[PDB]
Amino acid sequence: SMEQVAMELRLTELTRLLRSVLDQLQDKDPARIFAQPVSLKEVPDYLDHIKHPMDFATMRKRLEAQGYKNLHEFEEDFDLIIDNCMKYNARDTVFYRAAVRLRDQGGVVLRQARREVDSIG
Ligand code: NA
């Protein structure tokens, strides 16, 4: 149907917008702390601590399968990146502080993304 097609075109345009968002977020992480999964072969106890690991590469894979139906879903995954880091690592560490800074800077990006998604429909 043509109604199904129109829904598909909308999902594709949201995907495009969320790609630009993901690139902007990732530019706020020049050290590439959040780029890839934590290796279970180097924080071997990681999964006893953190139940739902997340990273930017994992988000990109979901994005390319048009796997985010709305901005809220994408935001949840970004918040897992930040939140997991703030739990596993202590307040005094470079990792925790990098997560605080990424959350602050990503706030700006996400705030406009919401206005654009709302505005475009
Ligand atoms: Na902690």
From Swiss-Prot:
**Where does the source fall among the domains of life?**
Eukaryota
Domain Bromo intervals:
9-113
Q: In which tissues is it expressed?
A: Highly expressed in testis.
Cross-link named Glycyl lysine isopeptide (Lys-Gly) (interchain with G-Cter in SUMO2), sites: K41
Q: Where in the cell is it found?
A: Nucleus; Chromosome
| Self-association state and partner proteins as the record states | Component of some HBO1 complex composed of KAT7/HBO1, MEAF6, ING4 and BRD1/BRPF2. Component of the MOZ/MORF complex composed at least of ING5, KAT6A, KAT6B, MEAF6 and one of BRPF1, BRD1/BRPF2 and BRPF3. Interacts (via PHD-type zinc finger domain) with unmodified histone H3. Interacts (via PWWP domain) with dimethylated and trimethylated 'Lys-79' on histone H3.
Q: Give the protein's biological function.
A: Scaffold subunit of various histone acetyltransferase (HAT) complexes, such as the MOZ/MORF and HBO1 complexes, that acts as a regulator of hematopoiesis. Plays a key role in HBO1 complex by directing KAT7/HBO1 specificity towards histone H3 'Lys-14' acetylation (H3K14ac), thereby promoting erythroid differentiation.
Q: What is this protein called?
A: Bromodomain-containing protein 1
Species whose genome carries this gene: Homo sapiens (Human)
Quick one: which gene encodes this?
A: BRD1
Entire-sequence positions represented here: 555 to 674 of 1058
